[PDB]
Amino acid sequence: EVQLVQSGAEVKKPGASVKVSCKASGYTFTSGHTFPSYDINWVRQATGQGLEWMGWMNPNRGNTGYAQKFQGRVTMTRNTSINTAYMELSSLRSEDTAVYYCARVRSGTNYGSYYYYYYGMDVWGQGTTVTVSSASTKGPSVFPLAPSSKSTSGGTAALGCLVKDYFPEPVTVSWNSGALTSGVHTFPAVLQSSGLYSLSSVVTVPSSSLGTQTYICNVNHKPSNTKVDKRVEPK
Amino acid sequence: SYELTQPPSASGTPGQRVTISCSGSSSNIGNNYVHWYQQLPGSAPKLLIYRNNQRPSGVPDRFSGSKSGTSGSLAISGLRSEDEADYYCASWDDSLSGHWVFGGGTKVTVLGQPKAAPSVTLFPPSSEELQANKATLVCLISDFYPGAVTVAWKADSSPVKAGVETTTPSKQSNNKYAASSYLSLTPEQWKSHRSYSCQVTHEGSTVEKTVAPT
Amino acid sequence: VSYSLCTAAFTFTKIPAETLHGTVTVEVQYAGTDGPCKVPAQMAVDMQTLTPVGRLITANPVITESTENSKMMLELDPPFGDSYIVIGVGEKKITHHWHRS
């Protein structure tokens, strides 16, 4: 029931700034002297790395506390009339490339100027990926990975699409406009030293259908507003 | 860097009890609490244990927690394959202005399934990509268990380390693992060799696939 | 049993109150969970040295709970004239100026 919904993926150049939003639902965003009080904290995580705390924000009065690492380039605000908190990170460096999470925790207790938390981060947003790179947005080139006798086992054949040289993430791949889901695997992307991504989607199909059924991979790269349809054939 | 200490990895067989330690200091765990988060693959973290030993609604009682002094412990009783995840401990540190501290995370591996050699599929550069003056070898690796493989590339018989990108293995719906590897070449390099091979090594056995320009 | 000093922040939950004997009672809330632990308490006139003046009436002032936000009360015997009630240690210590007589 309680849910934190974050804004969409962001891509920025070094030196830029990003503002991420976090809309709360299922509970009353502010106390009003009656409802349980909850703060919004923000935690980020680079791919394959741990959790890193950024700061806390009490949406009742809007007071904040930022981690020492980000003090001076982070601002946490909220618009209480629309149940939304915001995190703005400036002077973006490539080390800021990460997934940014907002998370709810029961508001702390004030000991003078000192804030004390006694509860866990009990609800997390789905995250928003922030990509910081000197690269510029670019749609992929889609190449067919054609099945031959070398890509065939028994009665099954592997065919796919190579989705090359796009930026930034993500791309989605479907086959035959979603009609084909069994045997479909879309692999994680690699990041090449060029700063461009690539990935592959492959399907295992019965070798008999290679002459009777058509196979189209549908590649969508929304960051560049590009959609590619590619028919993969045997030779 | 992470201001709580937990082991980078733990493992167990289904049914076993796995415990994960989380060590802090007197300004966090000592005078606050230990909370634990579970992060499933490709997921956001979720609150698993809070305030040392409390379970949020919907967390089964096979998960338990404890705290003693400046350290805490997560216990996963009756380990299940879906318990394969990253587990993070956390605490509120009151030194100076106060900040959340986290463990570096513990990857729990659940070894519950029979060994499976990888299926290896190697695609040569397509004619389209060659016409674009590029060349990529694509090595798809699926259906292996456990989820550790190393990939070696060969031009004829010589190793190739340049232009190689390989993805970390991840679990599929069939509970086996998959990974991919890429060899970037110029069209001239591709044509200048009789063959290229993707060699996948898994639990001391190597599966090889080979492609040729012709 | 032997207590170590409480490590987290304190805060006054009521105005310190003079007793019939000219002593003062203070009530503090404690932020930590490392209880049971010993409440750092003294009077001072010099806030940079914190050299003790007066004395403690309460022998072994302790937070007894091992959870946060518990309240305890203690009694101090202030010197005549001006001084400070000082609870806690370090930058988190709380103070209250006291005048006796």
Considering its fold, how many domains does chain A have in total?
A: 2
> Distance (Å, rounded) from C-alpha B182 to C-alpha B199?
12
Contact C92/A at CB under 8 A: yes
**Element at B128 (helix H, strand E):** helix B127-131
Kindly give, in sequence order, each residue whose CB lies less than 8 Å from that of residue B147, ignoring residues fewer than 6 positions away. Answer: B109, B169, B170, B171, B177
Q: Which token pair is B50?
A: 């809070």
Select the CATH number that applies to the domain covering B1-112 from these four: 3.40.50.300, 2.60.40.10, 1.10.10.10, 1.20.120.80. 2.60.40.10
Which of B57, B67, B123 has the most A C-beta neighbours within 10 Å, making it the best mutation to test the interface with A? B123
C79 within 8 A of C97, measured Cβ to Cβ: no
Q: Concatenated DSSP letters for A74-95?
A: EEEEEEGGGTEEEEEE-S--GG
Domain extent, residue A92, equals 1-134
A52 and A143, same domain (yes or no): no
> Distance (Å, rounded) from C-alpha B56 to C-alpha A2?
13
> Distance (Å, rounded) from C-alpha A161 to C-alpha B56?
43
In chain C, the residue whose alpha carbon lies closest to the alpha carbon of A112 is C11
CA distance B43 to chain A (A): 8
Q: Write down the residue that tokens 């190739």 correspond to.
A: B160
Q: Which of A100, A134, A168 is the last residue of a domain?
A: A134
Both ends of chain B: CA-CA distance in Å?
51
> Given this structure, which CATH class describes domain B113-214?
mainly beta
- Residue A196 CA to its chain's centroid (Å): 17
Domains and CATH numbers, chain C: 1-101 (2.60.40.350)
Q: Which token pair is C90?
A: 């370090």
CA distance A24 to chain C (A): 28
Q: Write down the residue that tokens 């035959």 correspond to.
A: A176
Q: Which token pair is B112?
A: 């519950």
A52–B98 C-beta distance less than 8 A: no
In chain A, the residue whose alpha carbon lies closest to the alpha carbon of B134 is A164
C92–A116 C-beta distance less than 8 A: no
Query: What CATH number does residue A219 fall under?
Result: 2.60.40.10
In Å, how far are A91, B35, C39 from A43, measured between CA atoms?
18, 15, 35
**Element at C98 (helix H, strand E):** strand C94-100
Q: Which of A134, A168, A193 is the last residue of a domain?
A: A134
Beta strands in B46-202 (DSSP E): 46-49, 63-68, 71-76, 85-93, 99-102, 106-110, 119-123, 135-144, 150-155, 158-160, 164-166, 170-171, 177-185, 196-202
Q: Which token pair is B157?
A: 């018989």
Q: Give chains near C: 3+ CB pairs under 8 A.
A: A, B
> Distance (Å, rounded) from C-alpha B164 to C-alpha A173?
23
**Element at B43 (helix H, strand E):** none
Instruction: Give residues 10 to 69 of C whose Cβ lies within 8 Å of B.
Output: 31-34
So where are chain B's domains? 1-112, 113-214
A111 and A225, same domain (yes or no): no
A 10 A CB-CB count for B115 gives 11
Q: Which of A84, A114, A134 is the last residue of a domain?
A: A134
Q: Determination method here?
A: X-ray
> Distance (Å, rounded) from C-alpha C84 to C-alpha C82?
7
A26 and A125, same domain (yes or no): yes
| Residue of B27, B33, B96 with shortest CB distance to C7 | B27
Contact A69/B at CB under 8 A: no
Resolution of the deposited coordinates, in angstroms?
Answer: 2.3
Q: Give chains near B: 3+ CB pairs under 8 A.
A: A, C
> Distance (Å, rounded) from C-alpha A174 to C-alpha A228?
11
CA distance A85 to chain C (A): 27
Q: Write down the residue that tokens 């695997």 correspond to.
A: A185
Contact A129/B at CB under 8 A: no
B32–C32 C-beta distance less than 8 A: yes
A55 within 8 A of A69, measured Cβ to Cβ: no
In Å, how far are A166, B72, B105, B111 from B17, measured between CA atoms?
45, 16, 18, 13
C31–B94 C-beta distance less than 8 A: yes
Q: Write down the residue that tokens 């070894």 correspond to.
A: B111
Contact C89/B at CB under 8 A: no
